[PDB]
Amino acid sequence: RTLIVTTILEEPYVMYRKSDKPLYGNDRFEGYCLDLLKELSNILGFLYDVKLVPDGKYGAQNDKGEWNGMVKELIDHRADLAVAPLTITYVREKVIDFSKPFMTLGISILYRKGTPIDSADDLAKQTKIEYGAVRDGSTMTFFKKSKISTYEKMWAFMSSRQQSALVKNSDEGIQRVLTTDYALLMESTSIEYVTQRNCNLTQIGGLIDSKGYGVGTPIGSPYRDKITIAILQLQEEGKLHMMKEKWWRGN
Numbered sequence: 001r002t003l004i005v006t007t008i009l010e011e012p013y014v015m016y017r018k019s020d021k022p023l024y025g026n027d028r029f030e031g032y033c034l035d036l037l038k039e040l041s042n043i044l045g046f047l048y049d050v051k052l053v054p055d056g057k058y059g060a061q062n063d064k065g066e067w068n069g070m071v072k073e074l075i076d077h078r079a080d081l082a083v084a085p086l087t088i089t090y091v092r093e094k095v096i097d098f099s100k101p102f103m104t105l106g107i108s109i110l111y112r113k114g115t116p117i118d119s120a121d122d123l124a125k126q127t128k129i130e131y132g133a134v135r136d137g138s139t140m141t142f143f144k145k146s147k148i149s150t151y152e153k154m155w156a157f158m159s160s161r162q163q164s165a166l167v168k169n170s171d172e173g174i175q176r177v178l179t180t181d182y183a184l185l186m187e188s189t190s191i192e193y194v195t196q197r198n199c200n201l202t203q204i205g206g207l208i209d210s211k212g213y214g215v216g217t218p219i220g221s222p223y224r225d226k227i228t229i230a231i232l233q234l235q236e237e238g239k240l241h242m243m244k245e246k247w248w249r250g251n
């Protein structure tokens with residue numbers, strides 16, 4: 001059985017290789033998730049075929065309980081595994097299984113260096129520095145559903161200034177931090193990726209929430225626990241660290 005692996009284009013997890021050489025099948029791709037998949041294949045001993053998810057979505061549910069994205073590929077048994085920066089969540093666990101996480105991350109703050117600002121409190125108790133998040137993304141949702149006193153104030157701040165505090169996308173948000181007295185709330189993985197490449201930017205404070213990326217499988221898949229095992233081995237031997245450094249390290 002050659003396993004079908006659903007995944008999604010997302011830098012630096014999954015990208016097309018910058019090459020016109022005759023590369024076919026799995027060889028067309030590179031990135032952290034491709035390296036992880038290669039290690040998993042070698043530990044477990046499986047053949048695999050990487051397939052980009054056709055609708056280009058991670059996976060969410062409609063009012064009819066119908067799913068899309070990589071999650072739907074697994075549910076429909078059109079993929080054996082999903083190896084991507086796919087968040088392990090309560091709603092997804094109802095319909096698919098996940099290995100234990102290969103990466104743990106959380107919302108944090110991206111801002112300029114050399115400022116007194118040190119945490120989320122330093123932003124909430126002031127208005128001279130604008131702060132927001134990518135509109136309609138996981139990060140904004142967190143602040144909109146959070147009952148944590150301090151994050152309720154931040155959302156009340158971001159929302160009252162929806163037009164200029166909530167950006168269109170990461171690229172826009174990053175440029176906004178670079179070109180104005182602005183702080184962007186974004187996942188720690190992305191902040192790390194951007195700060196490695198912009199010496200003028202830095203992360204502020206610690207993790208605001210916590211979640212992990214896991215390998216998705218259909219419910220009952222006999223590969224799930226084996227993949228967890230392999231992940232732990234990689235973690236313990238320092239391979240996940242070197243895999244992360246390989247892709248994240250900048251100049």
Ligand SMILES: N[C@@H](Cn1ccc(=O)n(Cc2ccccc2C(=O)O)c1=O)C(=O)O
Binds near residue numbers: 134
């Ligand atoms: N992990 C998410 C998808 N995903 C993946 C990488 C990632 O950086 N983000 C964060 C993100 C991407 C684009 C725009 C906004 C945001 C955000 O942090 O809100 C994700 O939401 C999921 O599983 O649905």
Ligand SMILES: [Cl-]
Binds near residue numbers: 098099100228
């Ligand atoms: Cl588990």
